[PDB]
Amino acid sequence: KSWVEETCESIDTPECPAEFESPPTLLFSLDGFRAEYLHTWGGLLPVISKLKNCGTYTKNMRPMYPTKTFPNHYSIVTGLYPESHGIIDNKMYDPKMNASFSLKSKEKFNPLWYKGQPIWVTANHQEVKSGTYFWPGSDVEIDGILPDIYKVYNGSVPFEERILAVLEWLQLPSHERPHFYTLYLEEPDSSGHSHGPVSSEVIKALQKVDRLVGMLMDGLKDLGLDKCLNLILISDHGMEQGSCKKYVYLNKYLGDVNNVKVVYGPAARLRPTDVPETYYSFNYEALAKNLSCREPNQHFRPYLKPFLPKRLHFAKSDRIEPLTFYLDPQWQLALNPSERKYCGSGFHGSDNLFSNMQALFIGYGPAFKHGAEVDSFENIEVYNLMCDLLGLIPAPNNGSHGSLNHLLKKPIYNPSHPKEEGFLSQCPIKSTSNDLGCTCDPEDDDIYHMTVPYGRPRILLKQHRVCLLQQQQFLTGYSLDLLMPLWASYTFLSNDSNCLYQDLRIPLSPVHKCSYYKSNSKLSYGFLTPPRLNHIYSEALLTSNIVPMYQSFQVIWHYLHDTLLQRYAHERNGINVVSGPVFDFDYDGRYDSLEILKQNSRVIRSQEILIPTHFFIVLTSCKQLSETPLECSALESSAYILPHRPDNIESCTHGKRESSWVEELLTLHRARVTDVELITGLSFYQDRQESVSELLRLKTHLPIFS
């Protein structure tokens, strides 16, 4: 009986043949295996289905941005964001090197492109042999290290020979036998491009790939290793059906110009022709503003590199163009109809939260649980997972180490909460009492736990000075070094102008007085906590509850609290809200140091002001609608990192449909709670009853569009 014909067997304890000390780990990749494939065509894939049913499976695995082979395949083995590991796209360009990059190019084998540290390099430093086969980055030597067994990429090599090649390596002597293995197949990406996600060719391809895995599993059984190997069946991205009618050509707005170069696809980027002479000299801001809102329902959007949604993490690299394009699903962008390969072919590269961009992940073996279905996770988390499977100390990556502990029978690494680096001090009443020049028209422990029911945010800033200001409706962590609130937490239940009051607990700043704000300047103040809480709550009008805010952003901020926040309180039976300013001027996704903060502090209206680049907001509720936010058994989080812009060009307000464009901005700039943690230097939910590993799972979560 073949392996696929046998039923499930619990591998609680690894059954390894002699000469084996611990079960090896094989990483099997199927390029272009969209997550929807297994959902729908499970009955046509008997081998893959058994691996799903006897292992740990996830409906959707979220890939990196853009959704391309090389960036994702390399992010898997490095656990790094594409903006950090160097491989931004299949085709890209580095200004500092004056060289282009391509799959079919001599520059591909250049070690100057590959940054970070792949797993086989990690394994080599800790005396662990690795045998790879056609994995991106295996051909090139990184840090002067090459895998003990490698093969330079040759797509003409038949798949069946690749499987046998790995099977032959498994028979090598214990000292010359690798402990880590990789496998790569071009299907069903190839069939996906040429015929589309819904075709007879992909079904034949899925079945072809399915029998090939069955060949591997039968091969493992004949070697007596079917219960002695950790298998990770993964993919790089999904596949979307392209259309000729749904394609964007830049020439229609610019003309047959030759001063600009466009990297075509659903994740388009633009650089000038005179490069690197005018790579920075070219002002992209003008071109971006000239391309925005040209159509009634435009299916593309010009984005300056820092203005992209933070969830994408696609800014802090030299290779990423300062001008990018975000497109609606099923849409691609190009300069001229001649540059593109084809318009009506199967494509990928769209937003990594799109439904069809989702990838496959199945973990099978003695180390993985049997028939366990887990929630979605990013591919950068897999790197740390493999280190635990190979007994390796992981290189510094972007994955929350330990967040995938629920997949394993016996977790190797037990995570802990980050220590508080902030210098926590107290603010008593000391300075009374200045005139604000404002016109106004006519115990403690119980109120603390009510405002921060999951625990106060911990200050990971080192070594920032923060005070805790307690009110009757909210608790705010105030910064003494910046003289503004870092965060404000409050609970809003299911059913419950030009004036301000001086908070005598904080030192007075000239920007706290209402006389500072005129009706002419676009810059004003906003509240972190809405004043319309519970008559009218006056402590929300404290000076310590205001932040510098553009008038254009107040349109979004007021609608967020007056309409959406109240609706969410009814749908989710109350919500706990934590809000605050975000300062990331170097657009690296992490909080700025005091040094760079002083460099970006503008002066306006004769006063020095540090104005926020973004504003974060975390909404927390109960998973059980019968419970209020003060009595949750399990949490329901959703975070947002909203861009603080002087105008609403991104939204195309023109047409004046306010209730529509705001929510579309909210949904677009949704982010992981971890993302907020990384960018604000705060740590949430530390006093929550669930374990650290569970809390990492919660904080690294993002919803899939469509």
Ligand X SMILES: *[C@@H]1O[C@H](CO)[C@@H](O[C@@H]2O[C@H](CO)[C@@H](O[C@@H]3O[C@H](CO[C@H]4O[C@H](CO)[C@@H](O)[C@H](O[C@H]5O[C@H](CO)[C@@H](O)[C@H](O)[C@@H]5O)[C@@H]4O)[C@@H](O)[C@H](O[C@H]4O[C@H](CO)[C@@H](O)[C@H](O)[C@@H]4O)[C@@H]3O)[C@H](O)[C@H]2NC(C)=O)[C@H](O)[C@H]1NC(C)=O
Ligand Y SMILES: Nc1ccn([C@@H]2O[C@H](COP(=O)(O)O)[C@@H](O)[C@H]2O)c(=O)n1
Which residue ranges make up the site for Ca ion (CB under 5 A)? 584, 586, 588, 590, 592
Least Å from the CB of residue 136 to ligand X: 18
Distance set, CA 557 to CA 57, 526, 588, 702 (Å): 39, 8, 25, 22
Question: Residue type for 102, please?
Answer: S
Least Å from the CB of residue 92 to ligand Y: 12
| CA dihedral sign of residues 476, 482, 484, 487 | negative
Q: Which residues pair with 647 in a beta bridge?
A: none
Q: How many residues does the chain have?
A: 706
Pairing of strands 180-185, 130-131: parallel
Q: CB nearer to ligand Y: give 153 or 413.
A: 153
How many whole angstroms separate alpha carbon 204 and alpha carbon 184? 18
Among 3, 134, 517, 591, binds ligand Y (CB under 6 A): 134
Among 8, 103, 424, 634, binds ligand Y (CB under 6 A): 103
Q: CB nearer to ligand Y: give 24 or 349.
A: 349
- Which one of Zn ion, ligand X, ligand NAG, none interacts with residue 529, CB within 5 to 8 A by kind? none
Would you count residue 189 as binding Zn ion (CB under 5 A)? yes
Among 50, 313, 319, 572, binds ligand X (CB under 6 A): 313
186, 155 contact by CB (below 8 A): yes
| CA dihedral sign of residues 600, 606, 607, 610 | negative
Q: What is the DSSP string of 503-523?
A: -TTS---TTSSGGG--SSSSE
Distance set, CA 306 to CA 93, 127, 165, 424 (Å): 18, 41, 45, 32
Least Å from the CB of residue 583 to Ca ion: 8
- Which one of Zn ion, ligand X, ligand NAG, none interacts with residue 390, CB within 5 to 8 A by kind? none
Residues in contact with Zn ion, shown as a per-residue x/- string from 45 to 74 under the rule CB under 5 A: ------------------------x-----
Least Å from the CB of residue 314 to ligand X: 10
Pairing of strands 56-58, 372-374: parallel
Least Å from the CB of residue 152 to ligand NAG: 8
Query: Would you call 211 exposed, middle or buried from its count of C-beta atoms within 10 A (0-12, 13-18, 19+)?
Result: middle
Q: CB nearer to Ca ion: give 629 or 643.
A: 643
Q: CB nearer to ligand Y: give 124 or 138.
A: 138
Place of tokens 């007056």: 562
Stretch that binds Zn ion, among 91-99, 127-135, 231-239, 664-672 (CB under 5 A): 231-239
- Which one of Zn ion, ligand NAG, Ca ion, none interacts with residue 588, CB within 5 to 8 A by kind? Ca ion
Residue 81 CA, distance from chain mean position: 8
Q: Which residues bind ligand NAG (CB under 6 A)?
A: 98, 154, 156-157
Neighbours of 623 (CB within 10 A): 11
What are the start-end ranges of the H helices in 82-199? 82-85, 119-125, 159-169, 189-195
Residues in contact with ligand Y, shown as a per-residue x/- string from 10 to 49 under the rule CB under 6 A: ---------------------xx-----------------
Q: Phi and psi of 473, rounded to 5°?
A: -120, -25
Which residues within the stretch 626-685 sit at the binding site for ligand X (CB under 6 A)?
Answer: 678
Least Å from the CB of residue 233 to Zn ion: 15
Q: CB nearer to ligand Y: give 147 or 302.
A: 147
Q: CB nearer to ligand NAG: give 100 or 171.
A: 100
Least Å from the CB of residue 162 to ligand NAG: 10
Q: What is the dihedral of CA 413, 417, 422, 423, to 10 degrees?
A: -110
The residues carrying an active-site annotation are 69
Q: CB nearer to ligand NAG: give 277 or 562.
A: 277
633, 498 contact by CB (below 8 A): no
Residues in contact with ligand Y, shown as a per-residue x/- string from 589 to 608 under the rule CB under 6 A: --------------------
Three-state secondary structure readout of 443-502: CHHHHHHHHCCCCCCEECCCCCEEEEEECCCEEEEEECCCCEEEEEEEEECCCCCCCCEC
Stretch that binds ligand Y, among 111-119, 181-189, 238-246, 256-264 (CB under 6 A): 181-189
Stretch that binds ligand X, among 77-85, 354-362, 515-523, 545-553 (CB under 6 A): 77-85
675, 310 contact by CB (below 8 A): yes
43, 19 contact by CB (below 8 A): no
Among 66, 71, 82, 116, binds ligand X (CB under 6 A): 116
Least Å from the CB of residue 398 to ligand X: 4
Would you count residue 187 as binding Zn ion (CB under 5 A)? no
CB under 8 Å to 179, separation ≥6 — which residues? 22, 24, 25, 123, 128, 129, 130, 390
Place of tokens 């090649």: 165
Stretch that binds ligand Y, among 9-17, 35-43, 182-190, 200-208 (CB under 6 A): 182-190
Among 83, 94, 189, 240, binds ligand Y (CB under 6 A): 189
Q: Nearest to Zn ion by Cβ — which residue?
A: 69
Q: What share of the chain is helix, strand, coil (3-state, %, to 5)?
A: 25, 20, 50
- Which one of ligand Y, Ca ion, Zn ion, none interacts with residue 590, CB within 5 to 8 A by kind? Ca ion
Place of tokens 């009510």: 450
Number of residues that bind ligand Y (CB under 6 A): 14
Which residues within the stretch 259-278 sit at the binding site for ligand X (CB under 6 A)?
Answer: none
- Which one of ligand Y, ligand X, Ca ion, none interacts with residue 69, CB within 5 to 8 A by kind? ligand Y
Among 28, 31, 196, 319, binds Zn ion (CB under 5 A): 31
Task: Give the H/E segment covering residue 364.
Answer: strand 361-364
Least Å from the CB of residue 72 to Zn ion: 7
600, 616 contact by CB (below 8 A): no
Distance set, CA 455 to CA 116, 250, 569, 686 (Å): 35, 50, 20, 6
Would you count residue 136 as binding ligand Y (CB under 6 A)? yes
Least Å from the CB of residue 354 to ligand Y: 16
Q: What is the dihedral of CA 116, 119, 125, 128, to 10 degrees?
A: -170
Tell me the HSE value of 14 on the side-chain side, using a 13 A CA sphere: 22
Q: What is the dihedral of CA 109, 111, 117, 118, to 10 degrees?
A: 10
- Which one of ligand X, Ca ion, ligand NAG, none interacts with residue 98, CB within 5 to 8 A by kind? ligand NAG
Least Å from the CB of residue 306 to Ca ion: 11
Least Å from the CB of residue 99 to ligand NAG: 7
Which residues within the stretch 561-600 sit at the binding site for ligand X (CB under 6 A)?
Answer: 588-590
Among 29, 60, 84, 90, binds ligand Y (CB under 6 A): 90
Which residues within the stretch 58-77 sit at the binding site for ligand Y (CB under 6 A)?
Answer: 68-69
670, 638 contact by CB (below 8 A): yes
Which residues bind to Zn ion, rule: CB under 5 A? 31, 69, 189, 236
Which residues bind to ligand X, rule: CB under 6 A? 80-81, 84, 116, 313, 396-398, 588-590, 678
Which residues bind to ligand Y, rule: CB under 6 A? 31-32, 68-69, 90, 103, 134, 136, 153, 155, 184, 186, 189-190
